[PDB]
Design a protein around this ligand. Sequence first.
Ligand code: 3PE
Ligand code: NDP
Ligand code: SF4
Ligand code: SF4
Ligand code: SF4
Ligand code: ZN
Lengths: 154, 94, 94, 154, 290, 44, 114, 176, 145, 206
Amino acid sequence: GEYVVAKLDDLINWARRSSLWPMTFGLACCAVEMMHMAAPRYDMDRFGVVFRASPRQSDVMIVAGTLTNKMAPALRKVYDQMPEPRYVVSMGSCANGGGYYHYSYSVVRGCDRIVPVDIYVPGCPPTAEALLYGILQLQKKIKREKRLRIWYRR
Amino acid sequence: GVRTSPTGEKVTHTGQVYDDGDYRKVRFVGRQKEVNENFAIDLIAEQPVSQVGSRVISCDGGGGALGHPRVYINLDKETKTGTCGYCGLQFRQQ
Amino acid sequence: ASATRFIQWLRNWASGRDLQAKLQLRYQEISKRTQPPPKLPVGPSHKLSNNYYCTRDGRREAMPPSIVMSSQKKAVSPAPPIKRWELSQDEPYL
Amino acid sequence: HQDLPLGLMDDIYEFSKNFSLRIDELEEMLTNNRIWRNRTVDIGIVTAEDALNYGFSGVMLRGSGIQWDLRKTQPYDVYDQVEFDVPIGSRGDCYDRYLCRVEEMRQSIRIISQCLNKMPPGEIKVDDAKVSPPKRAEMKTSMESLIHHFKLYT
Amino acid sequence: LHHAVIPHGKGGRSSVSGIVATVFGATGFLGRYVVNHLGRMGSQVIVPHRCEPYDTMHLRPMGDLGQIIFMDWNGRDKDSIRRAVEHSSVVINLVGREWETQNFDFEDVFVKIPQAIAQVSKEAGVEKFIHISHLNADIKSSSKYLRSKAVGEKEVRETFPEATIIKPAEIFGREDRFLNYFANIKTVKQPVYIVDVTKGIINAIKDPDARGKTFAFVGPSRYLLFDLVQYVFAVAHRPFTTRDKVERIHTTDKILPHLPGLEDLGVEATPLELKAIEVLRRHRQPAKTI
Amino acid sequence: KVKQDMPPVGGYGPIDYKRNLPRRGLSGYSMFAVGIGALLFGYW
Amino acid sequence: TSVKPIFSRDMNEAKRRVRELYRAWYREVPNTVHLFQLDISVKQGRDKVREMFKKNAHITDPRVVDLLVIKGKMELEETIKVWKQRTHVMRFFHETEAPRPKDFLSKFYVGHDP
Amino acid sequence: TYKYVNLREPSMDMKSVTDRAAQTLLWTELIRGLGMTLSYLFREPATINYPFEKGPLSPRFRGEHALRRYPSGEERCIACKLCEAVCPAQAITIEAEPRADGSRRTTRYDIDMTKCIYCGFCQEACPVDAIVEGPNFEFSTETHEELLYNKEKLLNNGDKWEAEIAANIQADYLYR
Amino acid sequence: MELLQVLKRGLQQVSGHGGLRGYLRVLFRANDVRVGTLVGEDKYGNKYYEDNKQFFGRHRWVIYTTEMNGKNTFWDVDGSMVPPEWHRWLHCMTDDPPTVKPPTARKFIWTNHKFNLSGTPQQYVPYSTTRKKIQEWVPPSTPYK
Amino acid sequence: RPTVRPRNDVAHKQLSAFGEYVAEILPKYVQQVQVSCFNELEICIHPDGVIPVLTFLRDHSNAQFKSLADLTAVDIPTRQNRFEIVYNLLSLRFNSRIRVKTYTDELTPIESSVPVYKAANWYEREIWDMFGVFFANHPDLRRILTDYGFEGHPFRKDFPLSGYVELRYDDEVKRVVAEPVELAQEFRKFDLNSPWEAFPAYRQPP
Ligand SMILES: CCCCCCCCCCCCCCCCCC(=O)OC[C@H](COP(=O)(O)OCCN)OC(=O)CCCCCCCCCCCCCCCCC
Ligand SMILES: NC(=O)C1=CN([C@@H]2O[C@H](COP(=O)(O)OP(=O)(O)OC[C@H]3O[C@@H](n4cnc5c(N)ncnc54)[C@H](OP(=O)(O)O)[C@@H]3O)[C@@H](O)[C@H]2O)C=CC1
Ligand code: SF4
Ligand code: SF4
Ligand code: SF4
Ligand SMILES: [Zn+2]
């Protein structure tokens, strides 16, 4: 009972973190370091993280850049169309909390006002390696999930 | 120089601590209050006073251009020591 | 730089270039990651005399605009006509 | 802000030495590819007169045959001291503008080569501490330098 | 008042409402509205949760930075309850379940757990306690769900005499198991809107006359269950489930004139006709009221 | 003595930049001759 | 007092453009409620249109009225062409804003603002 | 000086026309493109094995902030607020008072790492090398709040990273 | 033939990692079976290797310890596990390792490096470090209206 | 002198002569002509002259300013006409730049220069959006940079930096909503100006 639920959780966790398909919202300059993470030096594909996935086939949204008020509704709409389980990675100061434009009349002070965020990657921009560290941190968060164990104890 | 309040919360080097009735200490429940344990006021006090032969000494904090702006300290007063306003090192005219 | 001679021949033939002469991976030709310390030069204002700031004060030589007409002979152009560019002698045509 | 670290110019030379081959590989993929030419040739044709009136600049001008480059006509810094050619299109379409950009990369390597050879010695910011902050060693020893540092950063 | 909980600001996200609320059952239908209203005005919300943190993610945007705090808790572990409430000025109990599981019966969810929360809160010195019961709670009910609500309502009143007890009718709303229940398919019903209930709970926290009182939260109109289901099908443009739930759905909504209601808290009940389209638009002539 | 990043005495070696797409393959005549020759052998 | 006009040379000319704009908005609300799948009634939408027009009833400068009409037509164009999303249309209604206190005593209890 | 990228006249002799016919029908230039991608298949890839291998950085790298000490352990910061004044993002908030021994020291030193643009102006402005951007770039978090650094966090960073920070300053201070 | 020398180079990596089990251990822990020169080891168990015939960026690497600070890191390794003295070398911020150029010692430097603590009870929680600004008047404790 | 930007008297003389040339040919519109110490020629005109002056500079054989480099506004509240409209033009024929400036207030339209330069289309939309200056006879005047339904003109000096409203997702209504702006940390205003005059050459008479 316990052993089966635990092993099954390990299996589904391993599959989900080993096949993370990102939808990248390339809003501004942070999107460039995301391209460099896909580029040969880091090759995010080698981790099972495909380069570009369709939003309806996506498991993680990477918000890579400044989220303006004009753009905020569209970003929420994409998030709501994502199939679960879905995670959000906030990349860089702008998406984390507004950054250089925190005090602007046109800028959302952090994408976490619009969507729940799983990982915050600091930097302006974070280096491609910093973003990769963040993606691997998300993989470890998924490895900690115990959905079936909690289901069994309901 | 870390000490704990009656409720157990560590007091910071700036003297900060949540009092008994403050709800805000709920933020540490299940986590921790980050406190640096190397109190600078205590560490500088351990440094010995430096004995010099002149009325005026200069301090740049050590390391040449890696220290602080060079200042000159008057040591005429015999009651007390001369203290550097940047790094806290103490001097005394022998 | 570790490819066997057969594979080196194969990819050179497929590309049509001598790829081994210009590898896109870096080996020992790059500069050491520890260097001797620099000793940087100083600028022209680093003098002990004949160096009064009022003789090298660019900001204070700025003047308000010259008003040439206020509402208070041959024709001219804003500058001479531009000269025709010359065709490259290095490689006029791709 | 700072002078070049020792050894940088050597590494730029090593990179520049090999880069034109990388442009060649890019050109082998695209320049003569019939599919690439089908997608770009005679696409988005803009006339020389239309380009000027619509406020175009750069390759959007030169692709249409206009002989204009601010580095040549209104030079700044030391651009008057380096030699290079301005690539010019003939058809004012996407394919010509693609060719201009590729050729501009080659001329950039040509300029970079001259910069490496002609790099002079000396200071790297204006010797006027009412504009550019003094060196840290001076800021820590001289009263005037410290005042000027304090004021330039506040 | 301790200086940290003096209200400041203009009632917005970055304001300080002065409320420190522990909301048990915050990850359900009712809790998401209660947390949202608390976080709208800048309250400190402690969210004890039993579920995976992935299941609490929708609550994070509901408050400014630091205003939503999540804790692990177990209904049977009184220490986990004490950790969650000992810093709060009000405790809101929204724990419930429409069915029984292998590990929790209606008696656990509606008697033992509410009593434990009320008792620990009393021990910890919490000033306010809000407990959600049910309009039709009755020791003489066919539904074991409603029988357990009556027993639990009594226990909370004994354990925390100053508790505010709220007794809502069936609640309709986007995530309800009421209008959605019919759309997925003698008795009179008086369903109440989710936002009305939330406003009543929020106002019961502020109102100093609410302590010690029992409220009944009902909608403005009474309908025949047949009239309601017919209306639901019409609004959903459709051609017109435990056994315990069936008994509940067929229990006529009680008329308790002696209890104060939403109007006594300054809340105007929302007609089902205005909000029915909002709930049912995704499943795609008002009903006769008594 | 002043020590800052400088080019080596005499400068760096030459750097290529011009397009270099070397000519390869046979002429159109020869290519067609090989193709027709293959067909004739296949037919035979 | 001699200024360049925008569109109208006097208030009567300006008041014509106001009426034309009002009619355009009045007839657009039913399609707006349907296209944006709003939960407000058509009457609410028109009641909101009227309220927006009425707060500007005290204007007597034709140039100011002209700009209000100019801006009102831009807002209509954004709506008819569905450049706006649902959030933008519903921003007129301030649904998540709690009712601020208006009388002196209520304002006194909550803060320092006039 | 200028050059023409695309101004050439095809030779219309029979040999040249037949050459272009062969290219059209036998897809010669397309095959030549296949050769390039084939030659890349047999090249060593440029990928590094992160996190076991790391991209090269330099001593100037601007990463996570830290507050430094003198060798004795006394704080370098003397609450001059030059960093706070220069910060382009207003990411720094400082309060100060006389310490119990009379020293000029801060009681608050916060950096909002989600406002910060990691520009390094603060460490240029500092007259005592107190605030620095250290070499660490692997400090992503699960919550927004963890990126709002107070003085205790920044002093802890300095004590955690001082061994590397000092060596990097040693390598670059002669360029500053 | 060359393909022969390649194949024996592959076999040498098996014995270079102390047999089949060690070879498979590094293959599954790090997805890399290269054999390099051991540059040093830190107090946490991380081992550092170099091979200057590899292209820049692959010429230095770390095999993370299987256990650090009470955490099982056999599978769960992290870039933040590299202590600062080796951080400079591994990122090519310098040429010489701490075994040849040790860092300067200070009494306040952490003796025990910590990796990223986000998502754990050791995570950092922000708070205001200043004391209360305004003191409220406390009424007397004896009746006297 | 190593640190001082050198003067260029030849260009200063040429630009001054052309400035008088333009003023002689369009006296109906030219109010002021000036050349800066870094040799930039500015023509200040009555707003009625926008189309005639720009057309002349574009088409006249001794001008040929065929390219509109930029078009923008500046807000100066102390002026009766607070908005300064700036046209920056480029002549490839004579390798020269000129700047044409006019003015307007909140309620006075400016004639659209789209007929002269098609480039003006979006620049004028930006000016309308950011400053609220209305351009007459524009083919399509509407906001270009701000959010739909955005109220006010943010680049005016009296528009607050953080604006009046801010956005967040609200779960109850299941959409992004706009609410009055509250900041967890207010923007900190700095008073930086020294109380000592820096530039005597620009001293204003008392
Ligand atoms: C003696 C009697 C003899 C009688 C018999 C004589 C017959 C033999 C002599 C004639 C030879 C016939 C050759 C038939 C091949 C088809 C040729 C063809 O159709 O190419 C033309 C086509 C379009 O060419 P295009 O430049 O775009 O414009 C021309 C029209 N405007 O261009 C194309 O089709 C391009 C194809 C696009 C797809 C690109 C991806 C493919 C590239 C890799 C291909 C690899 C080769 C395939 C080998 C398959 C192996 C199974
Ligand atoms: N909705 C209605 O029509 C009416 C509801 N009520 C009462 O209002 C309250 C909330 O209503 P609703 O929001 O619909 O209830 P929900 O079932 O929607 O959510 C119930 C909450 O209780 C928690 N919970 C349930 N069982 C346990 C348990 N065994 N241990 C710990 N936590 C538990 C759930 O957390 P998890 O997600 O972790 O299970 C969830 O957060 C309940 O008391 C309900 O009976 C009263 C009248 C009408
Ligand atoms: S965080 Fe920095 S790099 Fe990223 S989008 Fe914002 S400004 Fe650009
Ligand atoms: S790095 Fe730049 S933005 Fe960040 S705190 Fe320092 S000065 Fe401010
Ligand atoms: S860190 Fe440096 S610049 Fe900032 S307040 Fe302290 S001493 Fe001044
Ligand atoms: Zn000192």
